[PDB]
Nucleic acid binder design. Structure first.
Ligand SMILES: Nc1ncnc2c1ncn2[C@H]1C[C@H](O)[C@@H](COP(=O)(O)CP(=O)(O)OP(=O)(O)O)O1
Ligand SMILES: [Mn+2]
Ligand SMILES: [Mn+2]
Ligand SMILES: [Mn+2]
Ligand SMILES: [Mn+2]
Ligand code: NA
Length: 313
DNA sequence: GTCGG
DNA sequence: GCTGATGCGC
DNA sequence: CCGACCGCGCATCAGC
């Protein structure tokens, strides 16, 4: 809230570069700037003050100067008013509609939610589900509901087999008071880096009607929809489940706890210490080093350990 | 769009 | 009917 | 001043 007007501005520019310009590196540049400014403990008075921060450069400092002077950004004003930009931006809020589908739709005059309904036969399964739950998927999930969801998943998992271990990661594990979705990391002793495990868990969650819909499902990843049992229905929620080798659990939990900016910052700092981190391993790239805890990974790269609650960048 | 090389 | 190409979310 | 900034699992379909 300290520099919220600035970070909101940079976030809206990011979304434009992602959805309309299809410029993913600019999208990420804007987000890294919004992130670093969010962390800045002073109220920003000038573009030059902001330019001191790593990731804020010449062009953002200028935009910051204009925002500070006028209270707005002319570039954003023009985008908002541009029918094609505005429509593409909008359509990409449907899960399953990305920059390419959005732009194709808009070129054919499909431009609003109603139009998508009028044309559901042009949508694939994922997009039809995105449309069906459009409002629900933009609602946040209160931590109290996440706690009930956790209990359902952790118990139904234990029903299928007691050696399974499910861990809710993402913003929940970082202790956020609300979450955009539910991210679940799954392990079983029989699946290691050598050695239907996911399908058994998915189908049970379907059996007790927690999982309502499927977006994508394979041997190691499930993307779908779930809903707490009900009164007014609870909203339908996005749920992601990943099955990962048990001996790669801690790299996995580190990664899927995030945040995504934190992961970016860690993989870059890793390189600055001779290491390379991914979702599965940490390597000097040579053999995967041994890991028994998240802190093991912090140690290797000489960072002070950070509890999950301190990785929300 | 930014920054280290 | 198959599959390389690519989109999507992450 | 110029390139790196992750790369992958899963679904779809244009082009044979
Ligand atoms: N592009 C990316 N680069 C690096 N790491 C990435 C990533 N996308 C996702 N991740 C990682 C970190 C997230 O915390 C985690 C879950 O990704 P997520 O898409 O569920 C976002 P989350 O952090 O859970 O907040 P929320 O909005 O859902 O409440 O997976
Ligand atoms: Mn999440
Ligand atoms: Mn989300
Ligand atoms: Mn997720
Ligand atoms: Mn990857
Ligand atoms: Na979308």
């Amino acid at each position: 809230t300290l520099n919220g007007g600035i970070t909101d501005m940079l976030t809206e520019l990011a979304n434009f570069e992602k959805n309309v310009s299809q410029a993913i590196h600019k999208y990420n540049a804007y987000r890294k700037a919004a992130s670093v400014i969010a962390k800045y403990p002073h109220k920003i008075k000038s573009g030059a003050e902001a330019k001191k921060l790593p990731g804020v450069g010449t062009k953002i400092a200028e935009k910051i100067d204009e925002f500070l002077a006028t209270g707005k950004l002319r570039k954003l004003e023009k985008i908002r008013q541009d029918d094609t930009s505005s429509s593409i931006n909008f359509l990409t809020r449907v899960s399953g509609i990305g920059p390419s589908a959005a732009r194709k739709f808009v070129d054919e005059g499909i431009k609003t939610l109603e139009d998508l309904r009028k044309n559901e036969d042009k949508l694939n399964h994922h997009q039809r589900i995105g449309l069906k739950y459009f409002g629900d998927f933009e609602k946040r999930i209160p931590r109290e509901e996440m706690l009930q969801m956790q209990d359902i998943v952790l118990n139904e998992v234990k029903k299928v087999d007691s050696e399974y271990i499910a861990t809710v990661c993402g913003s929940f594990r970082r202790g956020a008071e609300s979450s955009g979705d539910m991210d679940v990391l799954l392990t079983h002793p029989s699946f290691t880096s050598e050695s239907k495990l996911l399908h058994q868990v998915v189908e049970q969650l379907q059996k007790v009607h927690f999982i309502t819909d499927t977006l994508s499902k394979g041997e190691t990843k499930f993307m779908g929809v779930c809903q707490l049992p009900s009164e007014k229905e609870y909203p339908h929620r996005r749920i992601d489940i990943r099955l990962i080798p048990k001996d790669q659990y801690y790299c996995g939990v580190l990664y899927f706890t995030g945040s995504d900016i934190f992961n970016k910052n860690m993989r870059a700092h890793a390189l600055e210490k001779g290491f390379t981190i991914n979702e599965y391993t940490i390597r000097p790239a040579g053999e995967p080093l041994p890991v028994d805890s998240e802190k093991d990974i912090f140690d290797y790269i000489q960072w002070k350990y950070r509890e999950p609650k301190d990785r929300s960048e």
